[PDB]
Amino acid sequence: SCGAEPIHIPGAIQEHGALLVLSAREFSVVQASDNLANYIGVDLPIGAVATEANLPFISVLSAWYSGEESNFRYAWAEKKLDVSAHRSGTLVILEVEKAGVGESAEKLMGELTSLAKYLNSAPSLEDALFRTAQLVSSISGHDRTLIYDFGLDWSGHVVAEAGSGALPSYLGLRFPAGDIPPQARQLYTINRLRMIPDVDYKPVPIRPEVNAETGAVLDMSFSQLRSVSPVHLEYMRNMGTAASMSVSIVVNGALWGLIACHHATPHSVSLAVREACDFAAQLLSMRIAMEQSSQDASRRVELGHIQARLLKGMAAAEKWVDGLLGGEGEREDLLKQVGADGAALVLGDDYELVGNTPSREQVEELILWLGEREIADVFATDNLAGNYPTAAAYASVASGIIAMRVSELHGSWLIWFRPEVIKTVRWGGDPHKTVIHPRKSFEIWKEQLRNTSFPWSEPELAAARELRGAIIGIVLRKT
Amino acid sequence: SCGAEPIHIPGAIQEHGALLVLSAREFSVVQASDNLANYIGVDLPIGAVATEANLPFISVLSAWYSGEESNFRYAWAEKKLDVSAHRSGTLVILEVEKAGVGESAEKLMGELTSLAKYLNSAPSLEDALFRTAQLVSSISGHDRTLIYDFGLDWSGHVVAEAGSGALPSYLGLRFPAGDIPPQARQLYTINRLRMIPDVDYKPVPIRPEVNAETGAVLDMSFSQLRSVSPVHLEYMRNMGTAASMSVSIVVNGALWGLIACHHATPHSVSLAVREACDFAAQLLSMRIAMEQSSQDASRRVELGHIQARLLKGMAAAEKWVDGLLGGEGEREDLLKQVGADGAALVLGDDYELVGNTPSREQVEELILWLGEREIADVFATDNLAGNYPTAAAYASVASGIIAMRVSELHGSWLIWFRPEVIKTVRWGGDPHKTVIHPRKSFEIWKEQLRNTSFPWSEPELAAARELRGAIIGIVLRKT
Numbered sequence A, B: 001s002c003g004a005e006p007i008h009i010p011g012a013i014q015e016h017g018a019l020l021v022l023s024a025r026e027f028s029v030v031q032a033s034d035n036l037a038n039y040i041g042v043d044l045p046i047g048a049v050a051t052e053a054n055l056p057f058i059s060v061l062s063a064w065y066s067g068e069e070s071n072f073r074y075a076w077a078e079k080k081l082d083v084s085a086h087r088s089g090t091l092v093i094l095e096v097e098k099a100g101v102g103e104s105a106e107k108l109m110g111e112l113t114s115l116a117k118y119l120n121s122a123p124s125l126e127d128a129l130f131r132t133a134q135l136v137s138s139i140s141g142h143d144r145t146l147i148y149d150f151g152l153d154w155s156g157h158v159v160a161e162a163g164s165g166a167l168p169s170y171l172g173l174r175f176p177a178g179d180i181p182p183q184a185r186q187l188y189t190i191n192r193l194r195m196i197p198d199v200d201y202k203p204v205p206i207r208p209e210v211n212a213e214t215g216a217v218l219d220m221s222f223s224q225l226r227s228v229s230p231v232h233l234e235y236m237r238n239m240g241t242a243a244s245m246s247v248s249i250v251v252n253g254a255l256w257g258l259i260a261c262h263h264a265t266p267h268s269v270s271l272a273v274r275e276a277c278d279f280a281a282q283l284l285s286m287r288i289a290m291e292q293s294s295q296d297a298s299r300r301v302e303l304g305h306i307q308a309r310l311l312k313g314m315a316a317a318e319k320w321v322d323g324l325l326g327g328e329g330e331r332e333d334l335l336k337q338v339g340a341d342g343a344a345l346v347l348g349d350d351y352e353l354v355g356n357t358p359s360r361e362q363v364e365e366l367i368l369w370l371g372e373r374e375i376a377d378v379f380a381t382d383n384l385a386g387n388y389p390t391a392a393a394y395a396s397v398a399s400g401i402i403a404m405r406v407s408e409l410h411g412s413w414l415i416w417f418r419p420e421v422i423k424t425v426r427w428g429g430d431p432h433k434t435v436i437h438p439r440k441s442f443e444i445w446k447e448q449l450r451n452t453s454f455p456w457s458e459p460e461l462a463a464a465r466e467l468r469g470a471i472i473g474i475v476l477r478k479t
């Protein structure tokens, strides 16, 4: 139900600014927020053309519209206002907000240099997360400023935090995917900054509802005043947050996480600070990408060393199998190739168990089980019990596996094993709950992670797939 | 001779600031530039302790000294001065410069957002070089602002340029290594920013010459006022530049290039702008690193596809050689593995020539030549004539080679070929000249690049070394 709600066309804004829609062609007013008259101090009804009279910035706007710069910004000093417009197809969407009480742009610039210094310093990622979380908590002045890292299921967990102490510390906690639904995650991938200064605000409509130029409702994906999904506002109430301001951390065109800010009282944030909070969220995004690409390479090369040794060992050996387990050197490498505590090489009824494997009978029952599934190339799981309950009786030694068929449906198998790792995912409220209205309970929750191994990396899987290739070629050669 | 000159201990500064050295222990004056009295408006002789009287910022300095932040900055409003200190072992090195006539820090911040936008946009590297070159030429206001990219010999060439037109456009030109000597390149790796506002400045000494605390001359590696090598000042004269300001572009702890600024008249630049010019030079440094790591990976994976096909073809084939050249598919792949126009597989007197190779006799004479050299693993050159003059008579088809011995000193060879590429390295003055005093002539120069191929990439060499590994293993297996 949640996934289906269109959050980008509320036909309404928040109370803390005004909105004016006008046509590229002649800058004629097509739509407007009802409160516009309050900020602009001018009526200009639907059909009216904007002139140097009503809008003294009309000259610099017309200029910006012909240019490439994707967003407009003007300080209406005359009226103490921060103007800002963007392009939506053939439309120009003007947003007006009260300017922030003179902040040092040098101070902003400053703390945006300590990050830029600490970032290119190339220290621990955890440090960088906190050393960004902090500067944002500094320049914003919210009661709580957490960095939030999405996992692959689209749950996330808090990996850094700053805050006065006026709001509870959520550090180290999982929240479920449904808390930031798909259409929300997507919107935040392309619009990297959002603010809700008062949660109890009264939604200001846009009239007409239907833009006369396009013929549809106004698309508000890039409207920074856009009125937020009511269902989220209840969430914020249940959490005891009057204000919030989140920034998207996008790494390689995918949403990595959020810099999320919250306040116990209502809280606003100047156009400038918002623009420095995105800068910090970008600066970090660069670091993260490099940290991730450098970690992968440095693993890929590491595993590469092992595979080059095993590849040479199998070629050099007569029976070849003793290239994989001919001595302590070969056996330890087979296990290090994928970062596994044990492995089983099965050639019909010719079983070989290296390191710490389940019993010969448990592997037999497992290979028949696999055969029943449609396993092409490799099959990898860090929780075997999920699909194979029987495995729950050797989770201690084999909670995760990487399994590969070697012979064309002739019961040949190389299977790696990884023990149970007892984790306590300390959740943030009960995740499974479905009220769907959001949950009132945010009381710290705890479930034990039973019969689940430390997870397989993409390099590990890639190293395994290459070894399959290495073997198949020789097993087809010797057959 | 040039390499030997110590540029980091001139015992002197430039005219446009003052310098004060004082001891960590008690902040007692140990050294001082003779002009200090002019800026500070106080004597404080050698032995004097700094107090809230002579230095009203003494309180915030003492604070900074205990902290981690590696540099100090204070606006002496009282005296219209920009103070800045750094740590040298047990010393604190204060530099004082006149503040810049009130510049918008929001304007600076601005053009440092258009770069940050255009950078994470991930467009063409050439665009990013110009779209940084420009913003620097903007915020500095020098007559010429070139980006300079070091090659592997430590020559460089101009790859972007902005400038009013008051100074000649050097775009696309090589300058020789000796123009930025080794100790200079090294210093600029660890101190990423330098300025010379007037070239004809009168060097202000530091007394005493010998710091009484350390017992040596003052080390001025991180002094932004440090007096520059006279031999460089003559260079600037011969070039017709009264001012300059260069920023180091450091990619992965190595000096990638310089953002260089020059002025026909004397030109100064505010402490702030300098700090934004480094930010731009950093922002870019991040882009470059990613561009380079993403290009490499995307080549490594590409070549990886070919090697996986050839590896499979040799394994699948009986005589195996026809895995490398059994048909158009195998032959084209052998040549695409290294990005070569031709190759020669030589197994004793069993010659095989693919694509566009020299004559069977020219390869014979080349293999004997190689045998005379000490070639372990592979030998790669993009100019064969350099070492093998005879090759100059088949440069059209083989100006560059990658050659690998396959059989243990048993005349087995896989050699790839790359044709001559007629390039005109348009130099910037005569490079070979040695006056060593610098050259007066900066008249655009031209030498033809004869008998030299498009250069081998590290991925290409890496793909070749892996194929050697693939073959040796089978040639030792079949032998």
Ligand SMILES: CCC1=C(C)C2=CC3=N/C(=C\c4[nH]c(/C=C5\NC(=O)C(C)=C5CC)c(C)c4CCC(=O)O)C(CCC(=O)O)=C3CCN2C1=O
Pocket: A002, A007, A146, A148, A158, A175, A178, A179, A180, A181, A184, A194, A195, A196, A227, A228, A229, A231, A232, A235, A244, A245, A246, A258, A260, A261, A436, A437, A438, A439
């Ligand atoms: C690390 C913990 C954490 C969480 C879990 C969290 C949640 C969060 N939800 C946000 C947005 C939305 N949630 C929802 C919906 C739900 N949230 C829920 O918890 C539930 C049950 C729903 C509906 C199924 C929607 C529609 C939206 C889009 C609002 C808009 O239209 O702008 C948003 C973005 C809006 C904001 O910045 O406050 C957040 C960010 C704040 N935040 C956190 O700091």
Ligand SMILES: CCC1=C(C)C2=CC3=N/C(=C\c4[nH]c(/C=C5\NC(=O)C(C)=C5CC)c(C)c4CCC(=O)O)C(CCC(=O)O)=C3CCN2C1=O
Pocket: B002, B007, B146, B148, B158, B175, B178, B179, B180, B181, B184, B194, B195, B196, B227, B228, B229, B231, B232, B235, B244, B245, B246, B258, B260, B261, B436, B437, B438, B439
């Ligand atoms: C793209 C073209 C280009 C070049 C080739 C160039 C040269 C350049 N030389 C610089 C510095 C030095 N050259 C030299 C020495 C030489 N330069 C020469 O041309 C020659 C012949 C020498 C001595 C052998 C030295 C010692 C230094 C260190 C100065 C210091 O002590 O701070 C420096 C750094 C000083 C500066 O920023 O002006 C540069 C940068 C400026 N610049 C350019 O824009």
Ligand SMILES: [Ca+2]
Pocket: A149, A150, A151, A152, A256
């Ligand atoms: Ca993640």
Ligand SMILES: [Ca+2]
Pocket: B149, B150, B151, B152, B256
């Ligand atoms: Ca280069």
